Amino acid sequence: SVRVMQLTLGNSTITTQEAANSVVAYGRWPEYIKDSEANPVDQPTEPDVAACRFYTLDTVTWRKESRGWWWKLPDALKDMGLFGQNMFYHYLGRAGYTVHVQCNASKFHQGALGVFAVPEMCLAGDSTTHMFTKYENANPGEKGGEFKGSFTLDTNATNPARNFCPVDYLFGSGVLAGNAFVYPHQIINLRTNNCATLVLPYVNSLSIDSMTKHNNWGIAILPLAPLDFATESSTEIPITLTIAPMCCEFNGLRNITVPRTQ
Amino acid sequence: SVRVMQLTLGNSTITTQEAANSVVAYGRWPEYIKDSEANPVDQPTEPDVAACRFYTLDTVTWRKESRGWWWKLPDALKDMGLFGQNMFYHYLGRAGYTVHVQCNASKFHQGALGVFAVPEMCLAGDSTTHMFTKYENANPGEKGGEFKGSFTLDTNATNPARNFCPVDYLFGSGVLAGNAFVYPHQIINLRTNNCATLVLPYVNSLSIDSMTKHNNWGIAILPLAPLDFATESSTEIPITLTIAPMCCEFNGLRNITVPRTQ
Amino acid sequence: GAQVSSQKVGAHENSNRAYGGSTINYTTINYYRDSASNAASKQDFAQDPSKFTEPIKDVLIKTAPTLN
Amino acid sequence: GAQVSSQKVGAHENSNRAYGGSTINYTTINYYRDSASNAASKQDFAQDPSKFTEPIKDVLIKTAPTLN
Amino acid sequence: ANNLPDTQSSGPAHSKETPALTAVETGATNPLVPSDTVQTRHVIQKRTRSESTVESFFARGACVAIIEVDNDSKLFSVWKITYKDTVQLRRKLEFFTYSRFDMEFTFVVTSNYTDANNGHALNQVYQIMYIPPGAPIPGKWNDYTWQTSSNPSVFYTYGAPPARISVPYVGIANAYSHFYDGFAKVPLAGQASTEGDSLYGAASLNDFGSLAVRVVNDHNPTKLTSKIRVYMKPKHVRVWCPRPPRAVPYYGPGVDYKDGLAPLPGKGLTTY
Amino acid sequence: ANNLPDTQSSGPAHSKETPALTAVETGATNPLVPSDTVQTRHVIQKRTRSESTVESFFARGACVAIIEVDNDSKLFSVWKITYKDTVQLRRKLEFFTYSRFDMEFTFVVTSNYTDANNGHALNQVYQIMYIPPGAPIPGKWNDYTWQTSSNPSVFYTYGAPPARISVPYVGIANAYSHFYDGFAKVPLAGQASTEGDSLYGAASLNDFGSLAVRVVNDHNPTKLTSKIRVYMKPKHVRVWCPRPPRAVPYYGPGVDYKDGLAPLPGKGLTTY
Ligand SMILES: COc1ccc(OCc2ccc(COc3c(Cl)cccc3Cl)cc2)c(Cl)c1
C-alpha cells in the first residue's frame, strides 16, 4: 500500500509501516553520465555497493522549542565509509541520493515536520560583509546546522564568526518559508506518517563537479506545527536521518584531499 | 468503501470518512411527477440547483440527559434560501430529501443514536381535547422539537398550551419505540460511525400537496444508548443536521404566503 | 528563406481579410548567421506541471484514497 | 506571405496601365506577429440597416397598409 | 503558451469517490477542478496562457546599469558586467536556479552641460568596448587598449537611435547558475588561514569581464557629463528549478539580508 | 463600403398600393425610394459608401492628451489614460454604446527654452513608461521604477520622427463600454453611509493605468519645458448600439451637463 515499503541498497535495508508514498524530485531518478553529456575524458570509478548504501547520520531531538535543522549534500556524507574516501581521492564526483527521514511518536502526540530538498541551498550569513561565511562553517558535515527564530548580526570585528544566520520564516535565505513547497518535499505529520522519503537525481549546471567545493542539495527540516504531547510541556522525540548515495562516479584521481577544519 | 463518501448537490459538498453505508427509503430514489401521475395542469417550476442543495439547520447538543429530538419536512426548511421562497409562493409543492446527520466524538466515548425517517409522523398532544395542537406549535421550523421522558397533561384551561407531548418510549405517538425500526433508519453508534445518511423519496397519497398545510416526513433522533465519556459526568457533543431537498417542483403560483407565528 | 506564420487575430475589422488570407499571416526572414541575432519566434510550447505538482513515486487517482 | 489586392482607380492616366495589369494592384506583407501591429485593410463590408430601420416583429410591405 | 480545458457540465454525486479528501503529506498537490466539488455547466474555454510563457515573462528590456563618464580619470569608465546592480530583473531571474538564453543589449545614451550658461561642444561619439576576462584594461581614456583589434567595440554617435547588439549563450557551464552553494577554493589542512579562503557562493573572480566606456572626441574645458543606461533582454529562454521569490530587501550579491525582515502587514484572522 | 442601387425608371400609377401612406407608431421607418412617389428615369448609380464605413469614420489620429514636463517634482509627469480629456474623439466614439478595436498611439514631442537669451542643453531623450494598474508609480524622476524590467517603455530622442506603438484589445469585458449605467459597489443595509458608496457610471477606479513621462538627461539649471501630445487611432473597429450624439457641452466624465443647454438658434416656422 502507500504506507508499507522496503528499500534495499547494497547491504542495507529500510522498512516502514507508515509511509505517505515517496517523492522522486522533479520526476527524475538518479542516473550515470551519458557519453553525449560526458566531459572529463578519463575512466570513471563507480564504487557501486561500497558507496551506494544507507548511511545513518546523527539523530537530532525535536522539542516544543525547536526551530529547524539543515544539512548539505555531499557534505553530510563526507566521512561516511568508502563514499567519503572516493569523494576525497577524486577531483570530480557525482551522485544522487535516497533521503529517508525517520520520526515516530504515538497517537496522542501532534506536530508536523516539513522536509524539503533544495538545489543550490544558499544560506544567509551573520555579518555586514557579503558572502563572508567561511568554508569550515558552511560545511558542518553530518551534524549539519539549525534554523533560528531571528536575525542576529555578528559585531565582533576582532574575531568575526563568519557563520550563517538562517532565520526560519525567511527560509534562511530571504524568501518566505511558506513558498518552500515549490521544492521537492514531504510532510511528517505525526497523526499520519513515520517518515519522509525523497529520491534526488543529480542536479547542477554541469554533468560533474567538485564535491568538496560545491554542495548540490540542501535538506531543510522545519516544524510546521510544533511538537505537543498529552500535557507534558516536556516532550522530546528523536529525528533520525538516513541517506544513501546513488550512481556514484568519480573522475580525476590523485592524492587525497584533507580539508582544513573548525 | 462502505465508510468513505462524498455527496454533491448544487454548490454544496459533504464528505465523510466514517459512514455506515446510506439508506434509500423503501428503495425509492426521489423523482419528478410523471405525466401519467400528473394532477395540476399548469407548468411547474423546478428551481433545481437553487433549491436542491445542502442546507444546515441548527446544531443541537447531546448530553447524558437528552431524551431525543424531532423535525418535520418540509417545515424545517421553510426559511431556507430559495427553497423557502418557492414553498411560500406556490399553492402546491413536492420534494424528496437527502438527510445527513453529523455526530463525531472519540474512541473513548460511547452512545448510539437512532435516526428514523417517518412518513406522516403524527405526534401526541398535551390536553384532554383531541387534535388540539395548534399550527404554530406543530410547525417549529428548523429548531424542531424534543422528546420527553413522561406525559404531562396541560391543565391551564384559561391558556391552554395546545402543544405536543411526545413521550420517548411511546415514540411520541402511542406505539413502542423499539418497533420504530420498521421505518427507514440508520444508527450512529459512536464506536462505529460519524453520521447517518438517508435518501427520502416523496411519500404521500397524492402526487403533489400543500407544503404549508402538510408535512410529509418526520425525522426522529433518539438516544438508544446514552452518551458517556471517560469519567466526565459532564459531556456534550453536538449533533448537526444537514438536509437537501431533491426534485423540487411547484405548481399554482400566486402572491406569497405569510403564515401566522408563535 | 522566408518563414510565413499566421497571427492570432484579436480584434476583427469588418473585413473578410480579418478572417482569412495572407492578411492574417506575417512574414519573417533571418538576416544574420548567428542564431543569437535572431528575434524570439514566440511560438512557445507548454508542458505537464506534474514534475512539480505530483512528484510522487506511486501514482494516485484524485477520486481514490491518497493514503492507502 | 504577400497579399496582393487591387485598387479602385479614381483619376485615370492616359495609359493602359491605368486600366489593367499589376499597375492597378498594391502589395502588402505583415512584418509583426501580433495582429495589433497590422494596418487596417480597409476592404470593409456593409450590412442591412433593418435591425434599426425596421425592428418590427410582423414584416410589412411598403405598398401594403402598415396598420392592418 | 496554449489553451485551457473546457468546463464540462457536472451533476450531483453520492459515491465512494471522494476527490475533496486528500493527504498533502505525500508532497503532491490535489488536481481538483470545479466540477469535482460543485455542479458545473459546460463552458467552452477560450482563454490561453500565451503571455505567461517563460519567454514572454522575460521578453522586456530591463535596466541593469547606468555608466557615467565626465568629459570634464573620469574621461572613461569601466563597469564590471552583472545583473545584480539593479533589483527588478534580478528578482525575476531568481524565480529559477539555472537559465540558458541569448542576450540583447540596448544602450540609451544621454548627455548635458553642467553649466546653464557656460561651455560648448560638438556632437560626441562614444566607444563601448567589451573587455573579456584577461584582456588589458584601459589606464587612460586614450591608451593603446582602445585600438580594439580583437575586443568587440560599439561606436555610438550622440542623438542616433539607441545602439543594440546580441550576445550568444557565453557560459562555461551548460547553464547559468543563479545560485552556487559553494566556493572557488577548498582550504587545505595545514595552510595559513589567509590561504584557501574565498567568498561563499562565488565562482570566478571575473565571470564575464567588463565594459569600458569613453567619449572619443578631444575633451574641451567645458563641463559635460554623459550616462549610458544599459538595458538587457533575455531571448531564446530556458529555465530550470523554480524557487520562491525574494521577500525581503537584497543585501549584496548573495542571499544575505539585514533590513526589511518583516515584509507582511497585520490583518485580523477573522477580518475579511 | 459598397455600391448604391440604380434608379429604375418609373412611370405613372393609379393603384390600391399606397407606399406614401404609413404608420410610424410601429417603430419602423418607411423604406421609400424616389420611384415610389414620382416618375423616375433609369440612372446607373456609381457612388459608394466607402468613406462612411465604421473603419473610415475613425481612421484618423486624434489628440487625447498633452503631457507636460519641465526639465527645470515636474522633472517627470503621470497621465491617467483616458479618451475623455479631449472632446472631438470622445464625441465620435459616443455615437455607439460599445466598441472593440486595436489602438495606434503616435507621440509628437516638442520642447523649447523658456528664456530667449539664457541657458543651453544637449539633445533630450524621453522615456514614456506605461504603468499598468498595480505596478509601482514613480516618486522621483529617477527612482527604481524607471528600470522597466516588465513595464513597456518607449525611449524617444528629440527631433526623430514621432514615436508610434500599437496596443491590442485590452478590455476585461468582451467590448469597451462607452456607457455604464451602474456602480462598482452596492451599499448594503445597515452599513454606514460612508460605506458602499461609489461613483455613478464608474467601473474600476483604475481602468487602464497611466503613462509616466520624464527626460532621461541630467537636468541643467536652464529653464526648459517639453510637451508630449498623444494621438490615438482606433484600428480594426467594431461598434454596437448607436446613440444620438452629444448636443450640449460636456461636463466631466459623465453625461452631466450644466452650461450650453440651449444649442438651437431661432428660425421662423415659415421662413426658408
Ligand atoms: C543569468 O543572467 C546573466 C548571465 C550573464 C550576463 O552577462 C554575460 C555577458 C557576457 C558578455 C557580455 C559582453 O557583451 C557585449 C559585447 Cl560582446 C560587446 C559590446 C557590449 C556588450 Cl554588453 C555581456 C554579458 C548577464 Cl547581464 C545576466
Ligand SMILES: COc1ccc(OCc2ccc(COc3c(Cl)cccc3Cl)cc2)c(Cl)c1
Ligand atoms: C473606448 O475607447 C478607449 C478604450 C481604451 C483606451 O485606452 C486603453 C489603453 C490601455 C493601455 C494602454 C497602454 O498603451 C501604451 C503602452 Cl502598452 C506602452 C507605451 C505607451 C502606451 Cl499609450 C493604452 C490605452 C482608450 Cl485611450 C480609449
